Amino acid sequence: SKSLQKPTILNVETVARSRLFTVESVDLEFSNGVRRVYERMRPTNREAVMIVPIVDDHLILIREYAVGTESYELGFSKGLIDPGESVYEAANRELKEEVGFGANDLTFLKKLSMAPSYFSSKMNIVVAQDLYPESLEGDEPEPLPQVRWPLAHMMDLLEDPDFNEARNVSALFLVREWLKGQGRV
Amino acid sequence: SKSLQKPTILNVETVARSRLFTVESVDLEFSNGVRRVYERMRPTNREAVMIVPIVDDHLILIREYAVGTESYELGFSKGLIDPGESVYEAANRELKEEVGFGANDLTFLKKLSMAPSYFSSKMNIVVAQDLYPESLEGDEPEPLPQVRWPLAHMMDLLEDPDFNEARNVSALFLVREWLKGQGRV
Secondary structure, X not given: OOOOOOOEEEEEEEEEEOXXXXXXXXXXXXXXXXXXXXXXXXXXXXXXXXXXXXXXXXXXXXXXXXXOOOEEEEEOEEEEOOOOOOHHHHHHHHHHHHOOEEEEEEEEEEEEEOOOOOOOOEEEEEEEEEEEEOOOOOOOOOOOOEEEEXXXXXXXXXXXXXXXEHHHHHHHHHHHHHHHHOOOO | OOOOOOOEEEEEEEEEEOOOOEEEEEEEEOOOOXXXXXXXXXXXXOOEEEEEEEOOOEEEEEEEEEOOOOEEEEEOEEEEOOOOXXXXXXXXXXXXHHXXXXXXXXXXXXXXXXXXXXXXXXXXXXXEEEEEEOOOOXXXXXXXXXEEEEXXXXXXXXXXXXXXXXXXXXXXXXXXXXXXXXXXX
């Protein structure tokens, strides 16, 4: 039983590079002397933002095609934070490009890591309230159908496999704890 | 006024392959005739399993090195389901290899996807109870320190950045809901 000593990095090499993906090979030497080679996604400081808009006791969810699984996913609007932007700025911009609304009340609820064994990306969860119409051109290939989901039946979302993705589910439970906080359940 | 119509896959092509990563380029034609090229991880039907062992009103968490972030994450044991194994079989085996316990009571709580845009893999969350000592040989380079976390304070885990990752957080909330169900909160 001793302190958690990080393995030491002996070498890093780019093993594969696609247009959007760049995978590195990492040579490690753990504290017990074992040596091993890991493969990961080249670390980035680029963070993500996820917006959870609430309007008349309803959740504004969107339908978006996902090529990974080749199907339509039902969930919260997600986007990248631009260099220089704050979580609030980015959340308001992305809401505007995908949903067509801006929010006067944006609260930053949590920052989640995403599969740290291979990634180093961060996900910021923002709740959007007091909405107003305003559009920005996003780069979407097709329109994103919106779905209004009652807050009183939020939990029913867990019965829809199109929604059951770790980010959405984490956000749904985090938003509900927050709503519990001020009894808007 | 029209139903969703999935894009047609024009062409799939391996664009990059490392020793654990195979990226594909996908040519897509959306319903509106818009054509686009997306990149993704080669789809697999290989599923994952995540075990949440509970012993004396305590959660058995583990500390594991993540090369993506170069740090030790605090969380639940995760592993692959080998071809042929059921969720129960895989959960019991992986618990034995990583923590040294098998379990008489395994419950399959929920299945989730992780960023379906690029990945297809799904994760099965399994709660393990009624443990018995039994150790199997895994592929870990260093032993995984165990942490007993009181169920009376599970929600305190959200205060630890080492644990705040979408899979862990989802698991935490779903297990607490399951616990709520029978009042062992």
